[PDB]
Design a protein around this nucleic acid. Structure first.
Ligand code: MG
Ligand code: MG
Ligand code: MG
Ligand code: MG
Ligand code: MG
Ligand code: MG
Ligand code: MG
Ligand code: MG
Ligand code: MG
Ligand code: MG
Ligand code: MG
Ligand code: MG
Length: 74
RNA sequence: AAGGGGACCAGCCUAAACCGUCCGGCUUGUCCGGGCGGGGUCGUGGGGCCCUCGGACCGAAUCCCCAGCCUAGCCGAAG
């Protein structure tokens, strides 16, 4: 069963990663303990859209910095 | 059971795509979710979106009025 990890998990996976676990593990351990969420379409969208926003918010620095770098060094 | 002969006769509304709006969630957005509104309803497949050409007749199973009918009655030939 596919779930999205809200935490890095020892020898399981990394935060934001989509891993495959047994239904029981997810429902009776991972989910209730806030350690993961079901890889449903609705938050696979949410997962992706946050990856996208972060990549955008990163690029805005590397671009804004580089613009600052243009001023300096000259 | 099909088919044939008859009785009756009538076909519609949604869900989803896409759009709008409100509400709240938090993990801040081009986000997810819940309302509601628009859109859409089909098998010669249909619908959405994007271009591109073209801008009155139908009509309820709802509502209103009316006739007609029911719930009392009345006239009615000639020893
Ligand atoms: Mg028959
Ligand atoms: Mg017949
Ligand atoms: Mg008859
Ligand atoms: Mg017919
Ligand atoms: Mg809000
Ligand atoms: Mg939703
Ligand atoms: Mg929405
Ligand atoms: Mg909505
Ligand atoms: Mg088509
Ligand atoms: Mg109707
Ligand atoms: Mg009499
Ligand atoms: Mg008499």
């Amino acid at each position: 069963m596919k779930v999205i990890l809200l935490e890095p998990l020892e020898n399981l996976g990394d935060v934001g990663q989509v891993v495959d676990v047994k239904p029981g593990y997810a429902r009776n351990y991972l989910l209730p303990r806030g350690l993961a969420v079901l890889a449903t379409e609705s938050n696979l969208k949410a997962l992706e859209a946050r990856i996208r926003a972060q990549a955008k918010r990163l690029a805005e620095r590397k671009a804004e910095a580089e613009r600052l770098k243009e001023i300096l060094e000259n």
